[PDB]
Structures are given as structure tokens and as C-alpha cells.
Subunit: 116 residues, 4 copies
Amino acid sequence: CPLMVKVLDAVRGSPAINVAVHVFRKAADDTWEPFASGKTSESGELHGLTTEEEFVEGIYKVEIDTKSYWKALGISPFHEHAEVVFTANDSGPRRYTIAALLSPYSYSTTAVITNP
Amino acid sequence: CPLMVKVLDAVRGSPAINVAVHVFRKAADDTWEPFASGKTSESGELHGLTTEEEFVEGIYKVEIDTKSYWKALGISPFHEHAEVVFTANDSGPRRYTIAALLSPYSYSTTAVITNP
Amino acid sequence: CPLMVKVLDAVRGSPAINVAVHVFRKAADDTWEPFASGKTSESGELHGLTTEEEFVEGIYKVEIDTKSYWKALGISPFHEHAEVVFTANDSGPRRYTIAALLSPYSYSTTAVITNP
Amino acid sequence: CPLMVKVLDAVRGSPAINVAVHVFRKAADDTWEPFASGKTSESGELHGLTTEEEFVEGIYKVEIDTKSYWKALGISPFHEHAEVVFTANDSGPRRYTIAALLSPYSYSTTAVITNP
Ligand SMILES: COc1cc(C(=O)c2cc(O)cc(F)c2)cc([N+](=O)[O-])c1O
Ligand SMILES: COc1cc(C(=O)c2cc(O)cc(F)c2)cc([N+](=O)[O-])c1O
């Protein structure tokens, strides 16, 4: 699993469950080509987005639908979404975890990368 | 000053100076129109982007050029940029500080909103 | 002002007002001696804790009463407090801002240090 | 596993490996009784600190030796350590993950709690 997304909720101290996540790869045209999508599991994790062969070097965008998450909880959110844009695999394929920690008016994101 | 952007460096424990920031506003046709730009000062702050009259209700995008900041320090960071997208002034005029705290493989962002 | 503490609320997108803050300095016998205390203002900031002359080299502890802040809003938060312990002025006098960004089940803290 | 600690490195975008972690429970005397300790694994995780029977309600302190971690990497750190103090199990036993995301001049901590 070369790409995993994990979303956490800092208000409830829990995984952020059922969060929609969309992944895009920048076309050599310079626009965002759809790549994969899913919703986070009960553990806040979204696995199985891509494969080793498909996840080539490039610029990728992960869009996390934070606004829908907070609205479903009845909590006013600040952001329209949380976007993470990064270059992948430029020094060889790696296993990427993109983690996001959500609050209504703030979010954090980190990359945890491991070499298999 | 209804919109201020502040950028901090979590590696050196300092303001992030000379960071380029571009602001866009979503037009009626759903395209992003250039709204304002600038660079952070010695305090990490960017003031004077807009005025009370100009900063109407809308969806705004703040794009912080974090990659150039790290590259100038010799570092190849994870993110291409840090983008913050939000609806502004939906309940009347507010003053917004958009803060970002930067590390090579992570960033946090928060909004501090006050009622004038 | 060589030591300032700033506290922000990530749920409401606002300063965290009226947060109690206690500062201690480690004595020669390794005990924590009370150094200064105060509460955050309407801006989330606590100024005037110490002076250039008093704020000598040492190990300092800043204890932020985050639990009382959340409890007053009806929330039972995860943390009992947020503590920040650091060596100060080891390379000469500096001005320190200790910032904390609060959510019920998470907090972040950073230092912004400038040379007077 | 009722209590797990996970430590991540925001500078390298990786788990924080071999970080020393010490856990204490507040005595009814009001001082910190040693409880468990360990070092983070290659995944940045520390498992097996306690058991369901032993991890009773109480106030617990997790001390993460961040200073030694940064020193071993040759990077100047701000904090003497990162402490997380929390009340556990007051609404019944839960599975707690205490996560910490480390930078040299900043850290974050969150609790991810799941009900089995
Ligand atoms: C529950 O398990 C995990 C928790 C966490 C976090 O708490 C976290 C903390 C932050 O400050 C920021 C963030 F984006 C995530 C990160 C990972 N991870 O990355 O592998 C986990 O497996
Ligand atoms: C230097 O003083 C400030 C510090 C800070 C932070 O520590 C901070 C923490 C985070 O997790 C994320 C972030 F984007 C900023 C925020 C503001 N602010 O918003 O006005 C400050 O004035």
C-alpha cells in the first residue's frame, strides 16, 4: 500500500470516520487528473487507493472534505476543505501516510514516509 | 486590517520571513480571481492585503509558497505549498488572521477571527 | 518584554481569553520555584511576566491551565494542563513567545524567539 | 492494549524511532508514581506499556524524551521534554493512543480514543 490517508478529530479525540477523500495527479497538461477516492474507515484510515505500479513519480493532490465532516456533526467549520499537495517518489518509491488532524478552525497535516 | 497572514518556522523557532503569499477570490463563474499578494515581513506577518470595503463576502484562497521557503534553506520539503480556503464574512464583517506553522514534512494552520 | 505567552482556541477560531498561566524556574536544588503568573487578555496574550534583568539563564516551566478553560465552556477535555519546559537565554538574552493552540483532545505549542 | 504512544518526526517525515517514554500515575499522595516505560519502535510506536487490569482510572503522565531525540540527530531543540498529563478511564476503560508530532521548536499532541 504505497499511499494511505488517515484523518483524526481533535474535538472528540477519535478517528474521523466517513470523511471523503479525493486524490488527483497533476497532468503534464498542468491540470488535476482524477486518480483515486474513498472514505475513511472506523479507524480513520483510507487504504487501497493505488498500487505500486500506478503510483509513479509526480505531483499529487489529496483533497479531504473536512467541511462535510463538521457539518454532519453540527459544528461550524472554517475551511472549505483541506488540500495536501506534494511530489511523490522523486527519490524512489516509498510508502506514504498522509495524516490530518482536524479542528473546526484549524488543521494540521504531516507525511510519514517509510522505506520498504 | 481585515486579512492578515502570519507564517512561523517550527525548526528554527522564528518567524518565517520573505514567504510569498497569494490570495484569490472565487468568482461567480467558479474561477479563482487574483485578489492580493505579498511577502511576509521580518515578523512573519503580511499586512495590508485588502481593505474593509474590498473584502466582501466570498470564498477566498490563501496560497503560501512554503516550498520556496524551504528550498532557500537547502531543504526539499514534502508540500508544494500550503493552501487555506474559507468562506469570509458570511455573518458580517470580521478580521481574520490566517496563521501557518511550518516544518519540512508538516504544517499546521489556524484562523483567529475577531469582530471589529 | 522577554517572555510572552499566547493561547488560541482551535474550535472557535479565536484567542483563548482568561487562561491562567503559571511560570516556574528550576532552582539550584532542582526544585521548581514560582517565577511569575497571570491570565491571558482579550487578545489571548499574557504580557509583563518578567523583565530583562530578572529573566536570567535557566530552565523555565510554563503551565497553561487548559482544563479550566474547557470546563468553563462545558467541555471535559483530555489534558489536565499544557506544560512547556525549556532552557532560556543559553546563548545570550532572547525574547520568547510561547504559543499554544488548544482543542479539547489536542494541543500544539511553538516557540517564536527573536534577538533584541 | 489500553495505552499506546506514537511519536512522529515532522522534520524528516518519518516515525521518531528509539524515543524514550516514561509513564507515571499520580499517587493519592499527590506525587508521580512510576508506571511503565519503553522506547518507540521502527514504526514510532510503543506498545505493551500496561494491561486492562492495571490501567485503572487515575491521572497519568507521559514524558517523552524529545531532547535526547533531537540531540542524537544533531539538531538544536527548544524543549527539555514533552509531557502529556491526562485523566484516564473516567467514563469506562478505553483504548488510548497518545500521539506526538515533533519539531525542534514545536510539538503537538493528540489523544485518539477508541471503544472496544
Ligand atoms: C492514531 O494513530 C495516529 C495518530 C496520528 C496523530 O495523532 C496526528 C497528530 C498530529 O499532530 C497531526 C496529524 F496529522 C496526525 C498520526 C498517525 N500517523 O501519522 O501514523 C497515527 O498513526
Ligand atoms: C507568534 O504568535 C503566534 C503563534 C501562533 C502559533 O503558535 C500557531 C500554532 C499552530 O498549531 C498553527 C499555527 F498556524 C500557528 C499563532 C498565532 N496567531 O494565529 O495569531 C500567533 O500570533
